[PDB]
Amino acid sequence: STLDIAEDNKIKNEEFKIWKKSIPSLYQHISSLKPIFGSGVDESPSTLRSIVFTNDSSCNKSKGVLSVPLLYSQGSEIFEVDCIVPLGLHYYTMESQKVEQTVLIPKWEFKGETIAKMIYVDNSEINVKVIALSTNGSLAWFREGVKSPVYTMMEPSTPCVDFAISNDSKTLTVTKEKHENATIKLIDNSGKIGEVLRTIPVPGIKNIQEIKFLNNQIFATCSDDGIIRFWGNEIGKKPLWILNDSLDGKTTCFAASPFVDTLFMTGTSGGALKVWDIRAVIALGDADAELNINQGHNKVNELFKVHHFYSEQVSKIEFSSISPMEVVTIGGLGNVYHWNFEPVFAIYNEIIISDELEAESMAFYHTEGCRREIGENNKVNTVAYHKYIEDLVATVDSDGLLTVYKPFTGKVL
Amino acid sequence: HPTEERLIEFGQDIDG
């Protein structure tokens, strides 16, 4: 209907102006910019994009600004945008005037690839800075001052491919969804970068939606079936344990706690947030039993439970690198949920979370005024949480409008 | 009370 197009646009246009008013009321710092790329760069909306913050932040005491560069994925080239935020956030008309007028120059470009996922690693052993995983399952290691990658893993061009690196940055895991069993590809990233350490096909699963490492010798895998398959670095064809959750919908992704080797975060299409301990799943034992898909949900009671906004399918989660209670959640429509389980740890200290408890646990909800439209580009990797800057996150929409901000939780630390 | 691109504006109303 023609009114239906004037329906959703008009409602959001007021709702955006609603969130536009409380912008100075709910955040400590919020900024937006349009990426300015040189000639030849693809500016399409369906352009596959990703962003992740770098660790080479800069201080500016003479101007009170904090420089935070970010690596921007635009097709085959990687752009670098230095975000200007206030210095009072952790420890600006002209600072914005530069980046908006600075033509983004592609520092690293991988011709023949589509940037799907990237991981900035500070590894002085290989002297590398960024390792981007192409849409064709390919990865390329580029060092400082190098326009072309120094090492790459090139697969024959034909989907979904996810890449996760070990805690010591020595082992790389790569998924290859083949249209043919899904494969989890192991690549050593210490001395022999680019060579496959192993190949373990997962029979009966077509795609691996997410890859996440639990430790330096333990890894996990997630298929479309929502069954968590954790495979070990040891010499074993099958997973040592299998985690199956069908109570709160089909599982979408997972996250590993940086301080709790046993406690992890789970997500499902049903909008429920689950926190589970690895020792309990392994306590079941004997994953070598017949893989009865017909068997009901495993009787595994998780540690704690939460819910997203209106049961929104949680597509991504990442625990903070500075705080063990601050959690990042990604909804289906791009909204960034701010979760801080500090209240649950108190109710667990005096003795299911109540509706008021889950109401108190959410720090904030960043929808960007409904401007984060649901395009064809998956916004899973289009969100970057600062590992060294508290509550500072960056987002990339299909409109190219790059967003970086820090929310105000109101709790004076 | 319950109802009495067309579904798009409908899904937005339930959330608010």
From Swiss-Prot, chain A:
WD repeats lie at residues 203-241, 246-286, 309-349, 375-413. GO terms for cellular component: cytoplasm; nucleus; Rpd3L complex; Rpd3L-Expanded complex; Rpd3S complex. SMART domains: WD40. The keyword Repeat applies. Induction: By glucose. GO terms for biological process: cellular response to heat; chromatin remodeling; meiotic cell cycle; negative regulation of transcription by RNA polymerase I; negative regulation of transcription by RNA polymerase II; nucleosome assembly; positive regulation of transcription by RNA polymerase II; regulation of DNA-templated transcription. The keyword Hydrolase does not apply. GO terms for molecular function: histone binding; transcription corepressor activity. It is found in: Cytoplasm; Nucleus. A motif (NEE-box) lies at residues 13-21. InterPro entries: WD40/YVTN_repeat-like_dom_sf (IPR015943), WD40_repeat_dom_sf (IPR036322), WD40_rpt (IPR001680), WD_repeat_RBAP46/RBAP48/MSI1 (IPR050459). The NEE-box motif is required for the association to RPD3. Present with 3040 molecules/cell in log phase SD medium. Component of the RPD3C(L) complex composed of at least ASH1, CTI6, DEP1, PHO23, RPD3, RXT2, RXT3, SAP30, SDS3, SIN3, UME1 and UME6. Component of the RPD3C(S) complex composed of at least EAF3, RCO1, RPD3, SIN3, and UME1. Interacts with RPD3. This is Transcriptional regulatory protein UME1. The gene is UME1.
Curated annotation (Swiss-Prot), chain B:
The gene is SIN3. It comes from the Eukaryota. The lineage of its organism: Eukaryota, Fungi, Dikarya, Ascomycota, Saccharomycotina. Catalytic component of the RPD3 histone deacetylase complexes RPD3C(L) and RPD3C(S) responsible for the deacetylation of lysine residues on the N-terminal part of the core histones (H2A, H2B, H3 and H4). Histone deacetylation gives a tag for epigenetic repression and plays an important role in transcriptional regulation, cell cycle progression and developmental events. SIN3 also has a RPD3 independent function required for normal longevity. Disulfide bonds: none annotated. Present with 1660 molecules/cell in log phase SD medium. Component of the RPD3C(L) complex composed of at least ASH1, CTI6, DEP1, PHO23, RPD3, RXT2, RXT3, SAP30, SDS3, SIN3, UME1 and UME6. Component of the RPD3C(S) complex composed of at least EAF3, RCO1, RPD3, SIN3, and UME1. Interacts with ESS1 and STB1. This is Transcriptional regulatory protein SIN3. It is found in: Nucleus.
